[PDB]
Amino acid sequence: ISSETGEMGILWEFDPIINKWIRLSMKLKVERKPFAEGALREAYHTVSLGVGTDENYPLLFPPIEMISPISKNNEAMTQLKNGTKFVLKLYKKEQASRELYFEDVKMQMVCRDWGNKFNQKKPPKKIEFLMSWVVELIDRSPNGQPILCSIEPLLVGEFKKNNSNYGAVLTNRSTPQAFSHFTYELSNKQMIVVDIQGVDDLYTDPQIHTPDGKGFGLGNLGKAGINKFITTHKCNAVCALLDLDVKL
Numbered sequence: 001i002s003s004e005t006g007e008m009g010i011l012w013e014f015d016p017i018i019n020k021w022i023r024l025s026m027k028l029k030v031e032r033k034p035f036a037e038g039a040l041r042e043a044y045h046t047v048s049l050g051v052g053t054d055e056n057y058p059l060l061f062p063p064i065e066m067i068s069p070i071s072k073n074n075e076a077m078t079q080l081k082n083g084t085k086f087v088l089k090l091y092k093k094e095q096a097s098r099e100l101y102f103e104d105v106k107m108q109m110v111c112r113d114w115g116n117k118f119n120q121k122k123p124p125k126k127i128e129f130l131m132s133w134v135v136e137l138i139d140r141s142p143n144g145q146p147i148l149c150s151i152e153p154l155l156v157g158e159f160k161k162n163n164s165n166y167g168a169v170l171t172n173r174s175t176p177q178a179f180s181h182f183t184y185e186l187s188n189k190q191m192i193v194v195d196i197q198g199v200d201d202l203y204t205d206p207q208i209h210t211p212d213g214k215g216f217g218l219g220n221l222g223k224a225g226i227n228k229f230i231t232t233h234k235c236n237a238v239c240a241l242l243d244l245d246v247k248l
């Protein structure tokens with residue numbers, strides 16, 4: 001949207017309530033060096049140079065039927081307005097495909113809905129997952145295909161991982177564990193949200209397991225993932241406040 005120097009991107013926001021992707025453009029300026037790394041990805045400080053429409057970049061994955069024809073409303077326009085400092089995540093060089101960027105962002109959106117459902121029970125500590133978006137870094141040279149990344153708001157504070165996607169319980173806090181338990185029981189065992197991590201109860205990069213192991217990226221470890229969580233879960237006061245069953 002802005003005149004100043006930066007690179008262009010195609011920005012994708014998933015909206016679970018209409019079950020559609022919203023396609024936009026933005027300009028961003030990313031730092032040359034990462035400020036952190038995880039297992040597969042590196043995180044980069046980025047500044048937004050504004051969000052606009054995708055009109056100049058005519059359009060397949062996601063398929064056309066999954067894309068909203070209208071993009072006037074979105075979180076991006078406020079959360080990524082010009083000046084906003086945020087975080088860009090790129091796969092190192094290592095496995096990643098186009099589909100996986102979208103799966104991962106949609107997954108975080110699904111977890112974000114679970115956070116709201118959890119909060120509606122009025123737990124002692126309310127929780128929230130950050131927005132996440134797919135960005136096609138179209139100014140960067142494509143073996144093909146385009147450079148993709150995901151972006152999300154900047155968390156300020158000490159970043160802590162509370163559980164992994166395979167049974168680790170990494171801190172003593174109760175809410176992140178009760179939340180994982182809550183998603184499992186309240187989904188009637190259709191899914192569980194783990195990899196609960198972020199700053200305080202602002203969370204990012206969660207991971208879902210489902211019994212059939214289908215979808216939800218490469219970190220979906222299916223029944224094994226679910227059972228590994230069960231083996232290590234001790235119900236706490238939040239689990240009890242939420243009236244969750246001590247079995248399962």
Ligand SMILES: Nc1ncnc2c1ncn2[C@@H]1O[C@H](COP(=O)(O)OP(=O)(O)O)[C@@H](O)[C@H]1O
Pocket residue numbers: 036037038039040041042043087130152153154155156159204205
């Ligand atoms: N929104 C954020 N704000 C600030 N720091 C973050 C944010 N998201 C991730 N980080 C930091 O970047 C690291 C790597 O990100 P991560 O999502 O774990 O990548 P991977 O795909 O390898 O798991 C995290 O361990 C954390 O230290």
Ligand SMILES: [Zn+2]
Pocket residue numbers: 177178181233234235236239244
């Ligand atoms: Zn529990």
